[PDB]
Ligand binder design. Structure first.
Ligand SMILES: O=C1NC(=O)[C@@H](c2ccccc2)O1
Ligand code: NA
Ligand SMILES: [Zn+2]
Length: 257
């Protein structure tokens, strides 16, 4: 099955998932000089005050912090979006070294990691129905650079020892995702896809311009996770990112001048 190695990585995904070569695949390079300011875009409304985190899971591809999405609690509205999108989970993609790890790039720059907060459009009732729709999902992407520590990330870092291998989970209640945001909510947006199989073309991407800083020690802990299950040969969970894909007939819009 699919992964990030030589024999099962991004260059192989199209065999099982032919949409890998589709018309609106993600991630992409954001060419900042050609992303046009769109004065009709609205400020992003991030309403996370009532978020209920539940659990953290190593799924063999990343670690997901999962939320109660059975009701309108943590929601994303505004920006390029019509209606209301509920937060279901967040996770990261990261590198083996600080010079790579992000999925999106900015003028070809790769960041050390990228946070994805995944939301689904409540007009479709459940996540599974939302991923059958071209406007089913909204993913808020946030770049990570290595510098000062991010205090709001440390609770995540400190639980990782308990979910080292694929299939392990741990209770993870009362985590506030507001502590992972940068100051500014200025963003770029474009229509795209999931960046892993099944690569479904359901996503309004909202990529924040301002990275967050995390410390070297924080990202080093991400890199001690394992892709493998317990009692299998150890494969460090690093370089779990898909490279940039062809932009094709799309335009990236900026929310800011
Ligand atoms: O942007 C994405 N990051 C991923 O891991 C992938 C994704 C796969 C499955 C569910 C939600 C998101 O899409
Ligand atoms: Na453009
Ligand atoms: Zn992701």
């Amino acid at each position: 099955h699919w992964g990030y190695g030589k024999h099962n990585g991004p260059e192989h995904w199209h065999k099982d998932f032919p949409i890998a070569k589709g018309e609106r695949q993600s991630p992409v390079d954001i060419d900042t000089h050609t992303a046009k300011y769109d004065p009709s875009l609205k400020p992003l409304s991030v309403s996370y005050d009532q978020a209920t985190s539940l659990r953290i899971l190593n799924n063999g591809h990343a670690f997901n912090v999962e939320f109660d999405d059975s009701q309108d609690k943590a929601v994303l509205k505004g920006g390029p979006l019509d209606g209301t999108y509920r937060l279901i989970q967040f996770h990261f993609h990261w590198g083996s070294l600080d010079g790579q790890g992000s999925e999106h790039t900015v003028d070809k720059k790769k960041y050390a990691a990228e946070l994805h907060l995944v939301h689904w459009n409540t007009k479709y009732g459940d996540f599974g129905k939302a991923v059958q729709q071209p406007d089913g999902l909204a993913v808020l992407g946030i770049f990570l650079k290595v510098g000062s520590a991010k205090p709001g990330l440390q609770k995540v870092v400190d639980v990782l020892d308990s979910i080292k291998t694929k299939g392990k989970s741990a209770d993870f209640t009362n985590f506030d995702p507001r502590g992972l945001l940068p100051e500014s909510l200025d963003y770029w947006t474009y229509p795209g896809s999931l960046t892993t199989p099944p690569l479904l073309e359901c996503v309004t991407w909202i990529v924040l311009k301002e990275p967050i800083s995390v410390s070297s020690e924080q990202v080093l802990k991400f890199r001690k996770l394992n892709f493998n299950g317990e009692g299998e040969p150890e494969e460090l969970m690093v370089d779990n990112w898909r490279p940039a894909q062809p932009l094709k007939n799309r335009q990236i819009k900026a929310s800011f001048k």
